[PDB]
Design a protein around this ligand. Structure first.
Ligand code: NI
Ligand code: NI
Lengths: 381, 387
């Protein structure tokens, strides 16, 4: 039983060398641009110089906000909002991954808000305006290049919250598979785990009559599973990078959600306190959430076990088939190098209660199961 | 993989009773609305009264353009543009199927053009502005609820031209499966045959490395194959209508073709046939598509083979790629015939008398098609094989 509204105004520009589309795409906007990026990777790869060149071709007056953290922080958002006020910025260009875009979304909203951007992240102020912005993507993961959501951390309060607004869809996102070539193996693996985890979140629901969405989810998982072993030992293969970029962006922010569970993400956000790799936390927690919630409807995980993970049902219960499917998932991720226990990041049980309390700060959560549940899943991990 | 730009700003509102979303969606537009619809169907079903009621809740001043033709005429577009200037229209609401939406798109562009809308249809004048419009869809799988295209007929010249513009995407389209309950058995079958055909058109290409698009196409075909036999014997089942309405939007909005150009040769040939004989579009496609598939098989048999194996359940053990594919084409043709679709030109009482004239119409713009570039001899062979 579900009604839905779909709306995605982001322009998607896909293909080799399409960073050259920046001047044509920037003509309709002002000439004061704030360039936002993360660590040294864009300068190390040469994408920085590529972009600065195109921003020069567009007669744009460029300011920079470098150093966005892998788990982006409000202090950095506030610094960028300040730069927009100081230099009368008209437009923002995020060059990097999901963290850079999530941060750019908050600066875009924060540049038309009189106060502090943490108000927006916490949903105290619903944005009424935003600067326009665009992206040049360097790794697919969560679909941020083509959705309106953003996850920001407050290092002081040790909180990490997801917010969104219809006003902070990217105007355009330039997706060049070549721009993902320098992503190293570990982050390449993290991106694929995150992509698969997002599909899982959209699959575990109780809405009857989603036959095509189910096949789209299963199709996406199969494609990533086929691609990942070939990609990780051949990181500069255009075709394999193209497939993961396509399935991480347009495929995942398609009609796959056209209601997800998202409990595993909420628990990971709470554990992340530790400032750990997001998708690393997901690889540890997701199989145990699947085990914890299997009974709510074993048919969902059973269908993944049979249609995605090649589990043979002969002489097994529906529960058995599903649990086998979870084991193959975890083994698949572990075979890529992904972690599978909290000890892999040197995390013990000391702060589990504090972590669970943060996860429950906004009440019970989850759709496949409304989640003490949090603590049990943490302990199993 | 082909470079591509994807942009589709249409808001899709989907679900039971969602026509009640109209007033909330209209708050952002002016209050002079031209309500555009076709024949008597929406009044007979009660949808017309539902819409008028909602338009009353939105404090809107309603003018109407009723009687849009199944092949909408530029004359009717011009009538709508005249109404827009006269009553100072701000917004258009299309209630109906692809014909009603296509006509509304041409009125929307024509309402900002000083001259004759036929200039827009023929691409003599490229639109620079348009009135906004929204839709309430009454037919699945026409593609117009979520794209920027429109097909308009000049009754005088007997020409039918496809045009489009980034300015005439619908602002929103309200998709309620209940609003397709009165679509009769034959047209329900036609919509599903056309939807499968459009997937085929987007699947038959020589672009390497489209594994996910391939699976999206295969997945869509499998869902329709599972749904269609049940729907035609249960025409008011919400779930079956819902699945067809949902998949029919995806099949036709471009979310399948991104990164690969479709073939569209079978559509072009059916369009040539229909310019001569007054047959249903999907009927022509059911006849022609299996024979197009046989004619072009040698271009790359692995392509139809993959459909045969992944969609049509053909076992490949001890068979050549061509045999596997041909068995798949056979199973496709049998599936369509099992729904009631025709499979030979003779089913519509069409012989070989006009095949040459039809082939010439198909070739009016030179060679066509991407999986195989067809010339006149190709068209004649496909046509004759279809008798
Ligand atoms: Ni994620
Ligand atoms: Ni068609």
């Amino acid at each position: 039983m579900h009604n839905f509204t779909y709306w995605n105004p982001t322009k998607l520009i896909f293909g080799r060398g399409e960073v050259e589309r920046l001047p044509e795409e920037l003509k309709s906007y002002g000439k004061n641009v704030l360039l936002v990026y993360g660590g040294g990777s864009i300068k190390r790869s040469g994408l920085y110089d590529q972009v600065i060149e195109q921003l020069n071709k567009a007669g744009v007056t460029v300011h920079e906000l470098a150093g966005v953290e892998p788990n982006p922080r409000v202090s950095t958002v506030n610094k960028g909002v300040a730069l927009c006020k100081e230099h009368h910025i008209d437009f923002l260009l995020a060059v990097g991954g999901g963290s850079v875009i999530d941060c750019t979304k908050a600066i875009a909203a924060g540049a038309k808000y009189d106060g502090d951007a943490w108000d927006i992240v916490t949903k105290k102020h619903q944005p009424k305006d935003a600067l326009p912005f665009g992206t040049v993507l360097t790794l697919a993961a969560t679909g941020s290049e083509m959705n309106s959501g953003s996850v920001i951390t407050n290092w002081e309060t040790k909180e990490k919250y997801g917010w969104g607004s219809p006003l902070v869809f990217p105007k355009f996102s330039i997706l060049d598979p070549v721009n993902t070539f320098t992503v190293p193996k570990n982050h390449t693996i993290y991106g694929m785990v995150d992509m698969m985890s997002h599909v899982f979140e959209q699959y575990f629901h109780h809405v009857s009559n989603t036959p095509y969405q189910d096949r789209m989810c299963e199709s996406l998982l199969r494609t990533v599973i086929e691609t990942a072993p070939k990609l990780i030992n051949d990181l500069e293969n255009y075709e394999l990078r193209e497939t993961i970029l396509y399935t991480g962006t347009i495929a995942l922010n398609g009609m796959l959600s056209m209601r997800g569970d998202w409990a595993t993400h909420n628990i990971e956000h709470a554990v992340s306190v530790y400032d750990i790799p997001h998708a690393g936390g997901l690889a540890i927690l997701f199989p145990n959430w699947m085990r914890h919630t299997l009974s709510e409807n074993p048919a969902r995980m059973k269908q993944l076990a049979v249609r995605v993970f090649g589990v043979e049902e002969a002489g097994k219960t529906d529960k058995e088939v599903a649990l086998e499917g979870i084991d193959k998932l975890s083994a698949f991720w572990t075979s890529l190098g992904a972690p599978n226990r909290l000890a892999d990041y040197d995390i013990n049980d000391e702060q589990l209660d504090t972590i669970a309390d943060k996860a429950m700060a906004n009440g019970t959560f989850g759709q496949f199961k409304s989640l003490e549940d949090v603590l049990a899943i943490l302990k199993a991990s």
